[PDB]
């Protein structure tokens, strides 16, 4: 149960974005229905009044929280992967438009899931803004919690993978457009009951065997990481 508070750009806090530049839902409940329009940008998908200006090569950091800013972020138990996608704003997230910029699932050396690393990072994870066409974009951050993913929602609606989905409105100003955005996957649609990583038993299957849901990260992606970039208690 987690939500995005706002973003940082190059280590600078852009301020509380909730219902301002983040298309925030009313609470931290998960989305579970893989075929629902809620998979696109969560349950209150509408244009919000502001959009954060960035340039290609900038570091864009999502900052998540549970109940209040810089709290425990999400239950540590609730192990799973994190991804970030981009699409053009003109789509409103419809169609084959979502391109993957980042993926983290399980790290074998530290024996840590992305969710646990996120807690350590005080809710912060980042992508480097790619060299796409200048214009308006949606960046869709997605956390999948797997604690009930030994079942499928479609078969048992009281269980299933849990999706915490947040869309930020981002305006890319300076960019040479040298890696124009390729075709994307649809949400809903990309994830189905047979997709690797959707149904998994984290209690009995080794984490080293986990495979995150495709698609793979776009070759045009410029980087990203789960790591604290700024201190919320100060800025």
**Between residues 194 and 209, which has the closer beta carbon with respect to ligand NAG?**
194
**Between residues 35 and 155, which has the closer beta carbon with respect to Cl ion?**
35
48 is in an annotated binding site: yes
DSSP-H helix ranges across the chain: 38-41, 114-120
Tokens of 225: 């990481």
Q: How far is the CB of 74 from Cu ion (least distance, A)?
A: 7
Q: How many angstroms separate the Cα of 89 from the Cα of each of 43, 46, 69, 147, 186?
A: 18, 11, 27, 33, 14
* 28 SS3 class: coil
Q: How far apart are CA 225 and CA 4, in angstroms?
A: 16
Sheet holding 12-13, edge to edge: 12-13, 3-9, 59-65, 124-128, 224-226
78 is in an annotated binding site: yes
**Between residues 11 and 157, which has the closer beta carbon with respect to ligand NAG?**
157
Q: Which residues contact 2 (CB under 8 A, 6 or more apart)?
A: 28, 64, 65, 66, 73, 74, 123, 143, 164
52 is in an annotated binding site: no
Regarding 156 and contact with Cl ion (CB under 5 A), the answer is no
**Between residues 53 and 157, which has the closer beta carbon with respect to ligand NAG?**
157
Site string for Cu ion, 1-40 (x = CB under 5 A): x---------------------------------------
Sheet holding 52-54, edge to edge: 52-54, 162-172, 135-145, 82-88, 99-104
* Contact footprint for Na ion (CB under 5 A): 158
Binding residues: 1, 9, 47-48, 58, 67, 78, 129, 140, 147, 162, 164
Contact set with Cl ion (CB under 5 A) = 15-16, 31-33, 35, 46-47, 56, 68-69, 78, 104, 121, 131, 145, 175-176, 180-181, 188-189, 225-228
Binding residues for (1,4-beta-D-glucosyl)n are 9, 47-48, 58, 67, 129, 140
């Amino acid at each position: 149960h987690t939500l995005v508070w706002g973003v940082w750009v190059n280590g600078v806090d852009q301020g509380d974005g909730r219902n301002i530049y983040i298309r925030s839902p009313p609470n931290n409940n998960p989305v579970k229905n893989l075929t629902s329009p809620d998979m696109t940008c969560n349950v209150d998908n509408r244009v919000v009044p502001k959009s954060v200006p960035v340039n290609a090569g900038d570091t864009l950091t999502f900052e998540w929280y549970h109940n209040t800013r810089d709290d425990d972020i999400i239950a540590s138990s609730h192990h799973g992967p994190i991804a970030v996608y981009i699409a053009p704003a003109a789509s409103n997230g419809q169609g084959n438009v979502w391109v993957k910029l980042f993926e983290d699932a399980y790290n074998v050396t530290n024996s840590t899931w992305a969710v646990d690393r996120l807690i350590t990072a005080h809710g912060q994870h980042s992508v480097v803004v790619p060299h796409v066409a200048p214009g308006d974009y949606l960046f869709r951050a997605e956390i999948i919690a797997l604690h009930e993913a030994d079942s499928l929602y479609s078969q048992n609606p009281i269980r299933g993978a849990q999706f915490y989905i947040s869309c930020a409105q981002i305006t890319i100003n300076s960019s040479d457009d040298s890696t124009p955005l390729p075709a994307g996957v649809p949400f809903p649609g990309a994830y189905t009951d047979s997709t690797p990583g959707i149904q998994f038993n984290i209690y009995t299957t080794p984490a080293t065997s986990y495979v995150a849901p495709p698609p793979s990260v776009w070759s045009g992606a410029l980087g990203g990481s789960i790591a604290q970039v700024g201190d919320a208690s100060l800025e």
